[PDB]
Design an enzyme around this catalytic site. Structure first.
Site, PDB file in Angstrom:
ATOM      1  CD1 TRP A 194      -2.624   1.465   0.733  1.00  0.00           C
ATOM      2  CD2 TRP A 194      -1.579   2.041   2.577  1.00  0.00           C
ATOM      3  NE1 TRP A 194      -3.393   2.575   1.295  1.00  0.00           N
ATOM      4  CE2 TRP A 194      -2.564   2.993   2.661  1.00  0.00           C
ATOM      5  CE3 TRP A 194      -0.628   2.213   3.707  1.00  0.00           C
ATOM      6  CZ2 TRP A 194      -2.884   3.964   3.268  1.00  0.00           C
ATOM      7  CZ3 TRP A 194      -0.949   3.202   4.421  1.00  0.00           C
ATOM      8  CH2 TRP A 194      -2.021   4.139   4.440  1.00  0.00           C
ATOM      9  CG  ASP A 252      -1.679  -1.805   7.418  1.00  0.00           C
ATOM     10  OD1 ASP A 252      -1.409  -1.100   6.543  1.00  0.00           O
ATOM     11  OD2 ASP A 252      -2.692  -1.382   7.857  1.00  0.00           O
ATOM     12  CE  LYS A 278      -9.422   1.332   3.388  1.00  0.00           C
ATOM     13  NZ  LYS A 278      -8.002   0.753   3.828  1.00  0.00           N
TER      14      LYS A 278
END
Ligand SMILES: *Cc1c(COP(=O)(O)O)cnc(C)c1O
Ligand SMILES: *Cc1c(COP(=O)(O)O)cnc(C)c1O
Lengths: 396, 396
Positions: B130, B211, B246
């Site tokens: 990312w 993460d 999300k």
């Protein structure tokens, strides 16, 4: 890695709060609070923000990410509040606003932008200042230095000592100014003093950074912006970190803004892109809810009218508590000249109490104050004023 | 100071978004979106959060500051989600959670805590990862290094190359792992691979930083936590940065958490105090609204049941769009073996398209994708699937 990490200290207010809740005495008064409280000892949510929140609930269709700089209308609204509705800085588009997580968040993205995109090594801060300032600039590796400000024995702005300390600042240093309601003294420069400071500032090449957390608490919204606008009138560049925590009672929603002013739109856009890179590497993009409430109140006449009136009610409550404090002390009789309390603006003032006097104020009376004699005027109510002042007369 | 500040670049998604809105063609498809969209091309606010928000409006009496670490119940709830409801880490109180402004905010306070309180100089990140990861660690002055991960020609996890790259990491380095739905490949380690990684990790002295932004998008809430719990079972210390942007559709409310695990409650409290000092010098204390919504949904059975079902509906929409993509391409006929799309988890995958193929996909067809052939599966709907796949067959 964590087996010999040393413990961080506890910030004064936190420590006092613990000691206060653990205090079994019923008539206890906490004056070391840092937040506004009304005549009943509560920090309510404003009626204007409840109405703005009702509205957002009925109209929001997405929680999709805001841009790095937040919502555009929020930017519009703090620039007009800051610089005045038909300002040249706004018409020449020399300013850019990024929505940040509170005034502290605004100060940290400014520090990060400065440290990585320009040559500042030093930031000058008043002695004394709002405590967290040094940690914010030090985390960014920008060294903090202090200029004189408060006259302890006289309870006043020592302007001579101020301009004389600042002559050791050199061109290219940042000088941080509190826009109004100086934390923690409540002593503000007069408009002429703001204009000689503005003139001196351009002449020695200081980069002014204004911390504006109390707009509306000294005299009114436009009055309080007078000094910043004296600077903005003469400076090609400046940064202003503003907060809406206290004047909108939105403390935990983290709503503030960092506004960059540069000589022309071209250079402010280029500088602003690097400020956006700084935000992107910190929290990515800002929390919508508190800023969204501020933007719908400020853009709607009906809601903004209700808000302005709620803010003057806050300002006036603080102003009559300063009056009442001096009067009830003078009435309870000792050798007071607490008259300076009346001439200070905002929720904070140094009472002039010694640390052993505040220590027996807690131990013997349950009146809680910061060891420096700092007191938050919003913790005083008509009901606790006479128990408070009696305790102060007993330790004097 | 700002007259020769250079301009920061524009992050790919932003750039693509501009180019997309400025595209006059009507049947245009934007696959480079980064957010979830439903079958109608919208990112709605979930029904469970509207209900939690209605509730907060009727019950909030103050907007007073949350503690540095946010609301305690929010902490409870992400620890049980992360480590399992009756975990030893929770009963021995080895973990501490700070509420942060989103998953990015969590990664930055971890980076700042690490840089200033321990000896890490390096953070290992997967190739690819990312994008924003390197900026976050670099802003904290922690050097980033990459380990191999993706097998470009085979569309797979090159585990051998992975363990072999990581042998150059030395004891005391941080190794960052995506907990599930690896961004951007969608390739995740198998549970046995997670356990050999866990074993290797303790043996070479790596500090694991997870993460976790997509819990609930690969298989289910508990399934997705399997690898992290394989690590937590063997590690004395670890940091997990989680996001609720999300899985709760709360992107712009900035709700995430940074959880610290240490060998015992004593050392995690001491380390956690320094993590709180880091937060205090950044944004002071966290935004209440998004975290408050997450805490009332997760603590209420009725609301949490509705949320879980809304999340599986998201997960299943993504899973049938991966199916439909492979099938409509195989039906439109070319030399596909896009079968790997079915085996990848989450909203992202590399299509295997070349950058000049994605360039004529935009120019000639109006299908917008990131130049690396990265595609977000949530931008596909049953209605745009056949125009999309036809365009892909034409440039192959
Ligand atoms: C309150 C305050 C801030 C911080 O504002 P937040 O929005 O609470 O972070 C900054 N500077 C001064 C002088 C303040 O009083
Ligand atoms: C989305 C994402 C994040 C950031 O989460 P936010 O809450 O949006 O800041 C961090 N890491 C990965 C892998 C992500 O996909």
């Amino acid at each position: 890695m964590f087996e010999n990490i040393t413990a961080a200290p506890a910030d004064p207010i936190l420590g006092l709060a613990d000691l206060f809740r653990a205090d079994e005495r019923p008539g206890k008064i906490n004056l070391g609070i840092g937040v506004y409280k009304d005549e009943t000892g509560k920090t309510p949510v404003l009626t204007s923000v409840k109405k703005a929140e009702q509205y957002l609930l009925e109209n929001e269709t997405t929680k999709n990410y805001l841009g790095i700089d937040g919502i555009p209308e929020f930017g519009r609204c703090t620039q007009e509040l800051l610089f005045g509705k038909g300002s040249a800085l706004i018409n020449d588009k020399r300013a850019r606003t990024a929505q940040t997580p509170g005034g502290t968040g605004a100060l940290r993205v400014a520090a990060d932008f400065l440290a990585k995109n320009t040559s500042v090594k030093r930031v000058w801060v008043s002695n004394p200042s709002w405590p967290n300032h040094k940690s914010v600039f030090n985390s960014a590796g920008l060294e903090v230095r202090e200029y004189a400000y408060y006259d302890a024995e006289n309870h006043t702005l020592d302007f001579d000592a101020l301009i004389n300390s600042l002559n050791e600042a050199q061109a290219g240093d940042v000088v941080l100014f509190h826009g109004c309601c100086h934390a923690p003294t409540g002593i503000d420069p007069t408009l002429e003093q703001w204009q000689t400071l503005a003139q001196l500032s351009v002449e020695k090449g200081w980069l002014p950074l204004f911390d504006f957390a109390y707009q509306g608490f000294a005299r009114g919204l436009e009055e309080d912006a007078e000094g910043l606008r004296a600077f903005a009138a003469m400076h090609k560049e400046l940064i202003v970190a503003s907060s809406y925590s206290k004047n909108f009672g939105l403390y935990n929603e983290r709503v503030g803004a960092c506004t960059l002013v540069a000589a022309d739109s071209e250079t402010v856009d280029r500088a602003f892109s690097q400020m956006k890179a700084a935000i992107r590497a910190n929290y990515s993009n800002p929390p919508a809810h508190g800023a969204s409430v501020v933007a719908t109140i400020l853009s709607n006449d009906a809601l903004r009218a209700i808000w302005e009136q709620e803010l003057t009610d806050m300002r006036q409550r603080i102003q009559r508590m300063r009056q009442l404090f001096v009067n009830t002390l003078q009435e309870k009789g000792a050798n007071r000249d607490f008259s300076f309390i009346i001439k200070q603006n905002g929720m904070f003032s140094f009472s002039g109490l010694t640390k052993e006097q505040v220590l027996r104020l807690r131990e013997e009376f349950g009146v809680y104050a910061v060891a420096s004699g700092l007191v938050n005027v919003a913790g005083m109510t008509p009901d606790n004023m006479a128990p408070l002042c009696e305790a102060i007369v007993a330790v004097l």
